[PDB]
Design a binder for this molecule. Sequence first.
Ligand SMILES: O=S(=O)(O)OC[C@H]1O[C@](O)(COS(=O)(=O)O)[C@@H](OS(=O)(=O)O)[C@@H]1OS(=O)(=O)O
Length: 198
Amino acid sequence: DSKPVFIKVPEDQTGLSGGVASFVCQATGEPKPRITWMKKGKKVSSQRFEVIEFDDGAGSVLRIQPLRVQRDEAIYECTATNSLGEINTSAKLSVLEEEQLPPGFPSIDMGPQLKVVEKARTATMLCAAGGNPDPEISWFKDFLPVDPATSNGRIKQLRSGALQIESSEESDQGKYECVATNSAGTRYSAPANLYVRV
Ligand SMILES: O=S(=O)(O)OC[C@H]1O[C@](O)(COS(=O)(=O)O)[C@@H](OS(=O)(=O)O)[C@@H]1OS(=O)(=O)O
């Protein structure tokens, strides 16, 4: 048995009105702990917000869309509990209007497109971004983060930003979004579907 310990924590984030923001939190322990979200010191309702679980309840994602300045700008709190102890950690969301954007805020220069692939062949989803400084890229599939380090060689992110998927199978089907981040803020691409045929 052991007390819970964080292996992923949410960071401060600046987004754009009409857009999307996601926060991610995850912990280990024995028995497995349970994640819960709060807004301004009160528990969030799952019949009102989009909340998506993974790792048997030991990881969770809070997604907010479309962003609105008055309602959504606030302090958000993640908490993890098992029969041996409780730990917590917080982060702040800021939301900008179009005319407040600084010149180096990130942009999508070329985004991912619809793709139909035959089983057992390779599929590639492209993404090229710009800004100042140069942004870092990450990917989401059906609202959850993609982590290549667990595909045992199948799935990889290239230095250009593209996502490459070998030996395609039925579980690879779904809706993919590219995400670009730098010291000024965050921007999402439009979503694009992958289908597996024959
Ligand atoms: O910007 S707000 O924080 O006000 O957001 C809107 C909130 O207005 C409330 O009515 C409560 O008002 S309050 O000022 O006393 O927090 C909540 O609605 S309710 O049905 O769950 O009770 C909303 O909660 S919220 O949207 O999930 O954040």
